[PDB]
Amino acid sequence: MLIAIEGVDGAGKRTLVEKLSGAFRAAGRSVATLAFPRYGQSVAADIAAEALHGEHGDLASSVYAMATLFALDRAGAVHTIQGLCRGYDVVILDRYVASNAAYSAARLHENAAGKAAAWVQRIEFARLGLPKPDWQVLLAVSAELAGERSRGRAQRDPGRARDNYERDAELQQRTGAVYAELAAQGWGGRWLVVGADVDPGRLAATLA
Amino acid sequence: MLIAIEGVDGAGKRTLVEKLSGAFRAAGRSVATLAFPRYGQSVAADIAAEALHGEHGDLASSVYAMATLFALDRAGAVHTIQGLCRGYDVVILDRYVASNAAYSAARLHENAAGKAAAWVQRIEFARLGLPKPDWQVLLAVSAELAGERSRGRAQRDPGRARDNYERDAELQQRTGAVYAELAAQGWGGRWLVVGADVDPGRLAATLA
Numbered sequence: 281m282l283i284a285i286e287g288v289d290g291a292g293k294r295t296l297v298e299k300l301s302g303a304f305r306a307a308g309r310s311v312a313t314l315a316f317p318r319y320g321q322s323v324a325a326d327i328a329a330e331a332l333h334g335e336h337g338d339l340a341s342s343v344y345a346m347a348t349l350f351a352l353d354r355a356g357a358v359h360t361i362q363g364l365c366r367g368y369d370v371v372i373l374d375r376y377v378a379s380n381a382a383y384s385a386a387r388l389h390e391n392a393a394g395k396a397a398a399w400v401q402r403i404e405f406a407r408l409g410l411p412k413p414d415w416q417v418l419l420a421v422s423a424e425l426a427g428e429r430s431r432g433r434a435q436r437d438p439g440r441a442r443d444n445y446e447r448d449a450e451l452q453q454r455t456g457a458v459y460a461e462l463a464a465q466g467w468g469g470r471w472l473v474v475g476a477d478v479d480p481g482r483l484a485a486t487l488a
Numbered sequence: 489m490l491i492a493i494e495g496v497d498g499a500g501k502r503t504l505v506e507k508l509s510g511a512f513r514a515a516g517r518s519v520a521t522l523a524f525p526r527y528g529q530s531v532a533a534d535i536a537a538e539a540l541h542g543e544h545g546d547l548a549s550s551v552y553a554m555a556t557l558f559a560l561d562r563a564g565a566v567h568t569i570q571g572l573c574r575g576y577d578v579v580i581l582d583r584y585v586a587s588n589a590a591y592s593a594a595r596l597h598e599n600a601a602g603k604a605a606a607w608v609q610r611i612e613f614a615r616l617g618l619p620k621p622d623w624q625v626l627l628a629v630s631a632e633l634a635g636e637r638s639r640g641r642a643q644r645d646p647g648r649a650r651d652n653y654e655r656d657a658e659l660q661q662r663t664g665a666v667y668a669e670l671a672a673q674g675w676g677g678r679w680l681v682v683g684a685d686v687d688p689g690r691l692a693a694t695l696a
């Protein structure tokens with residue numbers, strides 16, 4: 281089974297991933313995890329990160345260019361995803377194809393039914409062959425609370441300064457609204473919306 | 489030996505490549521050839537082409553985004569280049585790293601000493617590890633004559649319509665001027681400037 285954890289920056293995805301993986305393991309299932317962007321593992325992922333922190337000229341100014349780098353990152357991990365799925369019972373991902381739809385739609389002030397989300401659909405799933413997730417969990421959180429966690433993370437960790445997207449409070453709010461639409465739409469597969477208080481044991485029972 | 493054939497669109501590079509490869513073979517050396525962008529062989533190369541023909545939203549509007557896709561294309565062919573160099577005596581390329589410097593510098597109205605050309609240097613050679621060419625041949629031609637060949641190619645071949653760069657006569661002229669600077673500078677390795685009348689036999693003797 282392939283599970284994707286989605287949400288805005290500072291929503292608390294990586295933590296939910298560690299709590300979830302533990303719950304599945306306390307249930308007897310082997311678990312594997314992968315996080316996108318795969319920093320350090322692919323040039324596409326790295327150039328993208330550097331671009332969000334101000335490098336590579338006008339790269340980050342193009343909404344479609346950024347989406348492409350993130351998609352090229354995933355395209356390079358297809359065999360790896362399939363391998364993990366064959367050998368493990370559960371595979372949890374920290375962000376997946378839906379992040380590209382939500383952020384791209386939000387940067388262009390479009391909704392989940394817009395052209396950007398449809399573009400991601402056509403390129404990543406149909407063309408690049410990334411397998412659709414069995415489940416997509418949306419850790420819904422107030423934009424204010426999320427931004428607060430992102431700002432705190434930057435204050436206490438020099439190698440964790442916020443990037444362009446994280447400094448745009450408006451983009452984070454719109455992205456939140458697009459995510460909520462994607463879920464109700466069942467975009468790319470079935471979704472499950474949870475909050476900060478979601479119980480890891482029950483949650484893992486819903487996804488089992 | 490690694491040889492790169494550079495020049496503006498319609499300069500006549502592919503033809504010089506077929507005439508050159510024949511001259512080396514008539515000299516007893518095995519020859520191998522590769523052309524960039526590697527259309528059909530890599531997603532990066534294909535998205536780039538589609539973008540130049542009007543697809544993928546605002547992608548082609550970013551100078552650095554296009555340069556990145558072309559570089560990602562090459563990055564994926566490094567092992568292939570090295571393999572060809574080990575097994576063959578001569579390897580001729582239809583366009584290589586210098587095209588990214590010339591076109592990028594020209595789109596930004598910079599010269600060969602500008603930041604764009606320096607960026608390509610840092611990312612493709614130093615970071616991605618593409619081997620520098622032993623020789624870089626610049627097929628210098630009048631911008632007018634080149635554009636004339638590009639327009640004729642489009643009239644007689646439906647699958648050969650000009651792309652964005654080819655329709656910009658001003659970009660083609662500036663790109664020509666940047667190329668001439670790159671050569672005099674010996675950018676990326678030694679250069680050889682030739683014209684339409686260059687003799688394939690002698691030329692191949694200079695590169696032998």
Ligand SMILES: O=c1[nH]c(=O)n([C@H]2C[C@H](O)[C@@H](COP(=O)(O)O)O2)cc1CO
Nearest residue numbers: 289316317350375376379380383445446
């Ligand atoms: O496909 C994507 N599209 C996309 O826009 N992103 C965004 C989310 C962030 O602002 C950034 C990477 O974020 P992070 O390292 O916090 O997961 O890029 C991330 C991905 C996944 O790679």
Ligand SMILES: O=c1[nH]c(=O)n([C@H]2C[C@H](O)[C@@H](COP(=O)(O)O)O2)cc1CO
Nearest residue numbers: 497524525558583584587588591653654
């Ligand atoms: O690195 C590059 N940078 C770059 O700007 N180009 C340009 C030249 C063209 O206008 C186009 C591809 O051209 P062509 O198929 O005629 O070789 O992209 C081509 C390459 C090589 O890939």
Ligand SMILES: [Mg+2]
Nearest residue numbers: 289290443446
């Ligand atoms: Mg982030």
Ligand SMILES: [Mg+2]
Nearest residue numbers: 497498651654
């Ligand atoms: Mg061309």
